[PDB]
From a paper:
Mimivirus is the prototype of the Mimiviridae family of giant dsDNA viruses.
The transition from Cl1a to Cl3a (5-start helix) corresponds to a rotation of each individual unit (corresponding to a GMC-oxidoreductase dimer) by ~−10° relative to the fiber longitudinal axis and a change in the steepness of the helical rise by ~−11°.
Numbering used by the authors:
A (entry chain A), B (entry chain A): 56 to 700
C (entry chain A): 56 to 351
The structure:
C-alpha cells in the first residue's frame, strides 16, 4: 500500500523546486512520481560540451532532443502556414525534466510583462522575491573573454540609439523609459562594468550586453558541468539512491520510473492515482489531501482529460469512461516563442582575425551576446501602453558559423566550407499564434497527442469593402509584420557595423547573404516611402495600385515571405496550457473540485520575456507558499543554497 | 481472473486472419488484445472517399495517417542520406490494424521472390493456396472505365518491348521469361480481355495492365465501402458488441482497448501477460499454452525487449529489470519500399480532352494503372539469377494532378493551377537500405521508439587504389543507381508516348518538367556513350577524367541527385523485423523458449513484390496451420467466404 | 414479467421531456415504449445539411420525411377542396419523435393565443415558466451574417407601417398594441440590437426581425449538429446502451423497438399494455398507477 497526501506528478523544473522546499518546511508524506532516471554519471549530460556531440559514437551522431532515451517526442499536426510541415519538439525525460536536456539560459522576464499581463497577486513586486530565490539557488556564471564582434555590435547600437532618442518617436526599438529615455548599453573597453539584464528591480527591459547566464559551475579541477533542477534540489545528499529521503527529508519518496495514467476519482474529491512501473505492474497511491501536476505544458491537459475533467461532448465522442466536470477550456491557448535566422558574409584581408574566439565553449555555448530590443516604430499591433512603457519584443542573438539547414545551404550556396559567416537571430518574444491540445486515446500516457499550431496563415480577400476588412487582415498578418520588422531591425544595424568596423582599424566588408541584401534595401526604400501603411501590400488585391512602384514593393514582400517559413527553428519554449482564469483560479486550484491543483508552466496566463525556465521555477516556489499558507521561501535569506553533491 | 492459452497480441492484418480461422477450427480459449475500437459507423472510414477528406470539418483537414485518434505516430531518426530530415510513418490503431487506414492494394508477390528468396517450406508452390484463400476472402474489384492515357502508355510499352525482345539483351526491363520471351501487355480496344497481375501460378512477373485491385465492395444502393480485415473476419456476425464470441465462435474474447506492456515470464515458459485498460487498471491474462505476437513491424521487437529476450548488454545498460535470453538479432534488419516522383506537362489544343476521367473515385482511388517492370539493363547490383529469371523491381504508377509537395511546387513553379499535369512513379520494390529498432524506456508501450533508417549516403573517397574500392562504392551507391535507372526508364517511354498520341489522332505535346527534361536527355547521352561504367562518375575524384564530357556528365549526375532526396514519399510498407533465421525458425517459433511465437509481417525474411498487405494475411493463415498441426485453410474450398455484415 | 406504474407510450417531443423530468424528481418505475432506434451515429441525421441530401447515394435522393426507415407514412383521404388529391405527412420514427426529422424552429406562441384561447390554468402567465425552461434546455442559436435582402424587406416594412399607424385603422396587419401602437421593427445597420420574437413576457406578437432560431449547436471543431429531444433528454449520459437508467435515473427503462397495440383493460382501471418486439413476440407490461400517451 502506498498511501499519500502530497502527490507530485513529474519532477520538471517546477516539480523539483516544489517538492524540495515543500519537504524542507513541512512534515507531510510526499510521493514524487517522475518517470525518468538520474543521469548523475552519464558524461554526455554532465559535460555541457556533450550537448554538442563530443561523446556520440560515430554511427549515431544525434542530439539528445531527438534521442528517445532522453526526451518525449510529440509530433505536431501540419502547419498550414509553413507549407504543411510537421514539427517535433521535446519535453525532457529525466529527474529535473526539460532542464536535463536544455540550452541553459536564465532570462527572468521583465517588470512590464508581469505587471500589465499577469493577474492580481502575481505582479512583478509580488513575486520578485521568488525569482531572487531561484536565481540565487542556481548561481549561474558568465563568460569574461573579449570578442571584437560584440564590441562592434554594441557600439553600432549606441550610434543608432542616439538618433532614436532624438526625433521624439515614443515606441522605437532602441528606447528605454525606465532609464529616463535611453537604454544603458554596456561599455566597450577592458573590464568595463557589466550590465546584468536580470536586474532585481527590472530597470532594464531594453538593453545591450555582452554575454549571457548559463547553468554551469566551474569545478576546482578545470571542467565545467551542467547545473539543473535535479542536480540542485534532488541529489545524493537529500534523497537515497533507492528513492528515499535522508534525515531532515525523511518523509520524501521518489518513484523514479513511473508513468501516471489518470487520477481515480470519487465524488468530486480525487482519491487515488495510478502509475506503471518498469516491470509492468500497476500500483495505486492513495491521496489524502491533494495531488500536484507539474508534468509540462503538453502532457498536463492530457492528464486532466484522462482523469475525467474536460469537455464532455468531445471526450464522450472518443469514449473516456468517466466524466467529472465540463470545462471546455482545458488545455486551450498554447503559446510559444519563434526564431527566424539570418546570415552575414565577411570579405577583407583580416576577417579571420575579426572572428576569433567565437567557437562554442563550456561557458558560452555558442552565444556571443548581444542585445534585447523592443517594438519597431512601424509595428501596428502594439498594446495601448506602448507609448508610456517599453516592451520586450525581440531577443537578439549572435553566433559564429552557419545556422541554416543543409537544404537551405544548398539553395543559397553559402556553406561553412567558405569561412565568412556569422548569424543574427531575432527571437520573437510576444509571438501571436495560439493553439490547443487534445487526446486521441483514453488508454495511457502516449508520446504524441493532437497538437494544432498554425503560424503564417495568409489572408484571403473577400468582397467586403476594404474599410472594414483591413482590421482583420492586420490581426491575421500580425506574425508576418513582426518578422518583417525584425528583418528591418537587423538590416539597419549592419551599416553602422560597417562604419564602426572600418573606423576601429578593421578593413573588412559586411553584406547579408541570407536573406539577400537587395531584397532588404528594396524593403527599406518601400518602408520609408510608404509609411505605416507598408503592410497594406501583403494583399495587392486591396490597395488597387497599378503604379509599378507599389507593384514592385508588393512583389518584394511576396518573395521575401518565403524565408521565415523555411529558414527557422521552432522554439521548445512551450507555455500557457491551463492558464489562470481559464481552468484555475489565482490559487492555481482547479475549478470544479476541491483537492487537485496545477502548479507548472501550463498555468501561466502569458508567456514571459525569455527562455521559459525561471518562470516555472518561480511558480513552483509560489505554489509551495500557497499550499503552506505562509511565506518562508520569500523570507529565507538569499544566500542559503541547497547543498551540492 | 482471465486465464487463457491462445493469446493474440494485436488485431492487425495478420491478427484477424489468425484469430478468425484459429477459432473456427479449434475449441481452445482465445483472447485477442487489440488496443483500438471498431469504426463500424464512422462515415469517414467506411466511405473510401473519406480517405480524401470529404468529411473533415474545415478547421482540421488532415489525413487519418496523421490524426492521432487513428494511427500510431513514430518519428524516425534523421536520415543522413536525405539532408537529416525525420519522417513519421503510421501503424494503424483499430481492429484490423493498418488495414483500417490504408490505400487498399493487393499485389501478392510473384513466384520469383518467394521461390528464390524464402526458405524451405515457404516456396511459392508451398503457400500459394493460402494466397488464393485470402484474395478469395476479400474479393476485391477493379474499374472498367476507359481512359486514353492508359492506352497511350500501354501501346508505347508494346512499341518499346518489341525492340527489347530483339537485340538479345537478357535482363532488360520490359522482358518476361515465363511468357517465352515477351511480357503479355494488355490489349487496347473496347472490352479487351483483362490481364490479372495476381495470377494463381505466378506467370506474370513483368506485365502491363490497366487498373488495380482495391478493397471495396459495391453495395446494392450505389455506394462503395471499405472492406478490410476487421470488416471481414471480426464483425457483428461473429463477435458480440461487448467483445464475446457468438455460438460457433463462443470461445473468442476481444478486449478492445488494451495495450500490452510485457509478457511476465517464468523459467523459460512465459506464463502471464499484462495490459492497461482505458479506465487505468492493470490486469493479467494467464497463459497456458502459447502467446501470439501480431503487433506490426515496429512494435513487435519492442514487445520482445520489454519482455526480457534480447541483447543483454544494451538492455542492461538502459535498465530493463529482467533478462531472459541473449539474442542480439532482435528487431534487426528492417526494410521498406520507396517511391520518387515525376511530373509531365501537356501542351496542345485538346489536352483537356486527353485527360478526362482521371479524378480519383471510389473504385480507382487516384490510380490509372499502369505497369510493372524489371531491372534496367545497365543495373550493376543484380542477383546471379537475373539472366535466367525475371525479377520484379519497379512498380510503375500514374495519376492525374500534381503530387509534389507545395515547397517543390514553389521551386519548380509548376502548380495544379495550370492544368497540364500528371505523375509517373517508379516505386522501387527491391530497395537496399536496412535499418534497426531499439527502445529507450523500459516502461510501457510508447508511440515512438529509436528507429534508424539511412537511405542516400554518398561515398567518401579514400587513398586506397580504385581497383579495390570500386566494389564498395557500388554497394554504397546502389540506391542512387537504382533510382537513376528508374529515371531513365520513365524518360525513355515519354517519346513513344508522343509518337503514339500524335498517331492516334491526338495533337498534344508531352515534356517532363520535374525533373527537367534537359537533365534527362543529357543523362541518356551520357549513359549510351559511357556504357555500364556510367556510375563511375558519382565520385569524380576516382575516374580522373579531365575531358569536359565526363566533367559535364558528372556535374549532371551531381545536380540530379537532389531530387530523389527531396521530391519523394516514404512508403508505409515496413517489413522484416524479426526474420526467419534471425530470431525465429521456420516454425515462426522464437528461439530460446518454448511457448512464444511471432506470426506477423516482421518475420518475413524478404520484402515481397508489392503493397505488403496480402503477405501478412498469408502468414496468418500459415501460422494457423502451424499451431493447428493440420492444413484445413489450405483445404477449405476456395468459394467459402466468411459472412459479411 | 414487466410490471410498471409509470408507462409512457412514445418518446416524442413531449415524451422525452415528461420521462426525463419525471424520472429526475421521482422514484417510481418508468417504462418508455418508443418504437424506434437512436440515430446517434447516422451522419445524415446529426449533420443538419444531411436534411438536404448531402449523404444520399445517387440512386435514392429522397428526404427523410418520405423514407420509410425514418417516418410513418399516413395518406390522407382526397381533398375535395384541392382537386381531390391525397397528401402524405410524416410523424417521426425515432427516439425524440418528429424532432429527429424536423426543420428546427422555435416559435413559442404569443400571449394572445393562450390567454384568450386556452382554458383556466393554462393562461400565458400560468405556463410561461415552462416555456422558459424548455427554450433554456435547448438553447438554440441564430445567424449573424449580413444580407441586403432582409434589410430591404425590413425597411420597406417600416415605410408601410408608418402609414398604418396613421389613418387610425385598428386592425391593420402591421400594427402592434403592446408596443403602444407600433411594432418594433429590427434596425438596419451593422450590429444593430436584435429583436427576439420569443420574448419572455410576450410583448411582440407582431414584429420584424432578421433571422430565426434553430436547434443546432456549434461544436468546438467547426461543425454544426442537430440538437433535439432525444439528443438532450435521453443520451448516453443517463440511459444505458441497452435501455437502462444510469445511477440517479436507475428506475428508467427504454424498450427501444416496441409498437403498442392497445391497453388491456379491467373494470374501468386499465391494467395492462401490449407491445410487439422486433423478434415478433408479444409481451405485457403490468400497470400499477397510470399510463401515459405521447404518441403524436
Ligand atoms: C532543446 C531544448 C532547449 C532548451 N533551451 C533552453 C534555453 O536556452 N533556456 C532555458 O531557459 N530553457 C531551455 N530549455 C528548457 C525549457 O525552456 C524549460 O526549462 C522547460 O519548459 C521546463 O519546464 P517544466 O520543467 O515545467 O516542464 P518539463 O520539464 O517538461 O516537466 C515534465 C516532466 O514530467 C515528467 N512526466 C511527464 N509525463 C509524466 C507522467 N505521465 N508521469 C510521470 N512523469 C511524467 C517528464 O519526464 C518531465 O520530467 C530547453 C529545453 C529543450 C528541450
Ligand atoms: C498510409 C497507409 C497506406 C497504405 N497503403 C497501402 C496500399 O496501397 N496497399 C496495401 O496493400 N496496404 C497498404 N497499407 C497497409 C500496409 O501496407 C499493411 O497492410 C500493413 O503492414 C498491415 O500489417 P499488419 O496488419 O501485420 O500490421 P499492423 O496493422 O500495424 O498491426 C498492428 C496492430 O496491433 C495493434 N497494437 C500495436 N501495439 C499494441 C499493443 N501494445 N497492444 C495491443 N495492440 C497493439 C495496433 O493497434 C494494430 O491494430 C497502407 C497503410 C497505411 C498506414
Ligand atoms: C418534415 C417536418 C418538418 C418539421 N419542421 C418543423 C419546423 O420547422 N419547426 C418545428 O418547430 N417543428 C418542426 N417539425 C416538428 C413538428 O412540428 C413537431 O415537433 C411535432 O409535432 C412533435 O410533436 P410530438 O413529439 O408530440 O409528436 P411525435 O414526434 O409524432 O410523437 C410520436 C412518437 O411516438 C412514437 N410512436 C407512435 N406510435 C407508437 C406506438 N404505437 N408505439 C410506440 N411508439 C409509438 C413515434 O415513433 C414517435 O417517436 C417538423 C416535422 C417534420 C416531420
Amino acid at each position: 500500500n502506498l498511501e499519500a497526501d502530497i502527490v507530485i506528478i513529474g519532477a520538471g523544473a517546477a516539480g523539483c523546486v516544489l517538492a524540495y522546499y515543500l519537504t524542507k518546511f513541512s512534515d507531510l508524506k510526499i510521493i514524487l512520481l517522475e518517470a525518468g532516471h538520474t543521469h548523475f554519471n552519464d558524461p554526455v549530460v554532465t559535460d555541457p560540451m556533450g550537448f554538442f556531440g563530443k561523446y556520440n559514437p560515430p554511427n549515431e551522431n544525434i542530439r539528445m532532443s531527438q534521442n528517445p532515451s532522453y526526451a518525449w517526442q510529440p509530433a505536431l499536426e501540419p502547419d498550414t502556414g509553413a507549407y504543411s510541415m510537421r514539427n517535433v519538439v521535446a519535453h525532457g525525460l529525466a529527474v529535473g525534466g526539460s532542464t536535463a536536456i536544455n540550452q541553459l539560459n536564465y532570462i527572468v522576464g521583465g517588470r512590464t510583462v508581469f505587471d500589465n499581463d499577469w493577474p492580481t497577486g502575481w505582479k512583478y513586486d509580488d513575486i520578485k522575491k521568488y525569482f531572487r530565490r531561484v536565481l540565487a539557488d542556481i548561481s549561474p556564471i558568465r563568460d569574461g573573454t573579449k570578442v571584437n564582434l560584440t564590441n562592434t555590435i554594441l557600439e553600432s547600437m549606441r550610434v543608432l540609439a542616439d538618433q532614436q532618442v532624438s526625433s521624439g518617436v515614443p515606441v522605437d526599438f532602441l528606447i528605454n523609459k525606465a532609464t529616463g529615455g535611453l537604454p544603458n548599453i554596456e561599455q566597450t573597453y577592458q573590464g568595463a562594468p557589466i550590465v546584468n539584464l536580470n536586474d532585481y528591480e527590472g530597470i532594464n527591459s531594453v538593453c545591450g550586453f555582452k554575454s549571457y547566464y548559463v547553468g554551469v559551475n566551474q569545478l576546482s579541477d578545470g571542467s565545467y558541468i551542467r547545473k539543473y533542477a535535479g542536480n540542485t534540489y534532488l541529489n545524493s545528499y537529500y534523497v537515497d539512491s533507492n528513492g528515499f529521503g535522508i534525515g531532515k527529508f525523511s518523509n520524501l519518496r521518489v518513484i523514479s520510473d513511473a508513468v501516471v495514467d489518470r487520477i481515480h476519482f470519487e465524488g468530486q474529491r480525487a482519491v487515488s492515482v495510478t502509475y506503471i512501473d518498469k516491470k509492468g505492474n500497476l500500483h495505486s497511491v492513495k491521496v489524502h489531501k491533494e495531488v500536484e501536476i507539474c508534468s509540462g505544458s503538453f502532457f498536463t491537459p492530457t492528464i486532466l482529460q484522462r482523469s475525467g475533467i474536460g469537455d464532455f461532448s468531445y471526450l464522450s465522442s472518443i469514449g473516456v469512461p468517466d466524466l467529472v466536470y465540463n470545462n471546455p477550456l482545458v488545455g486551450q491557448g498554447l503559446r510559444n516563442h519563434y526564431s527566424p535566422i539570418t546570415q552575414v558574409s565577411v570579405t577583407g584581408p583580416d576577417a579571420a582575425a575579426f572572428l576569433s574566439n567565437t567557437a562554442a565553449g563550456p561557458t558560452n555555448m555558442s552565444f556571443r551576446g548581444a542585445g534585447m530590443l523592443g517594438y519597431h516604430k512601424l509595428e501596428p499591433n502594439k498594446p495601448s501602453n506602448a507609448g508610456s512603457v517599453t516592451y520586450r519584443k525581440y531577443e537578439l542573438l549572435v553566433t559564429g558559423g552557419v545556422a541554416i539547414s543543409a537544404d537551405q545551404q544548398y539553395l543559397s550556396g553559402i556553406s561553412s566550407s567558405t569561412g565568412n559567416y556569422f548569424a543574427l537571430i531575432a527571437d520573437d518574444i510576444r509571438f501571436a499564434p495560439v493553439g490547443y491540445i487534445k487526446i486521441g486515446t483514453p488508454n495511457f500516457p502516449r508520446d504524441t497527442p493532437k497538437i494544432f499550431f498554425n503560424t503564417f496563415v495568409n489572408y484571403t480577400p473577400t468582397t467586403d469593402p476594404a474599410d472594414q476588412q483591413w482590421p482583420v487582415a492586420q490581426k491575421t498578418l500580425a506574425p508576418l509584420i513582426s518578422a518583417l520588422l525584425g528583418y528591418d531591425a537587423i538590416y539597419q544595424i549592419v551599416q553602422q557595423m560597417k562604419v564602426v568596423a572600418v573606423n576601429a582599424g578593421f578593413n573588412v566588408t559586411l553584406q547579408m547573404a541570407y536573406p539577400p541584401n537587395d531584397l532588404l534595401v528594396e524593403l527599406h526604400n518601400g518602408l520609408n516611402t510608404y509609411g505605416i501603411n507598408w503592410w497594406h501590400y501583403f494583399v495587392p488585391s486591396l490597395v488597387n495600385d497599378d503604379t509599378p512602384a507599389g507593384k514592385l514593393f508588393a512583389s518584394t514582400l511576396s518573395k521575401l515571405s518565403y524565408y521565415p517559413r523555411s529558414g527557422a527553428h521552432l522554439d521548445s519554449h512551450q507555455s500557457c496550457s491551463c492558464s489562470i482564469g481559464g481552468t484555475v483560479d489565482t490559487e492555481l486550484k482547479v475549478i470544479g473540485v476541491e483537492n487537485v491543483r496545477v502548479t507548472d508552466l501550463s498555468a501561466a496566463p502569458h508567456p514571459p520575456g525569455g527562455n521559459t525556465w525561471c518562470t516555472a521555477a518561480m511558480i513552483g516556489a509560489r505554489a509551495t507558499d500557497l499550499i503552506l499558507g505562509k511565506p518562508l521561501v520569500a523570507n529565507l535569506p538569499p544566500e542559503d543554497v541547497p547543498v551540492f553533491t
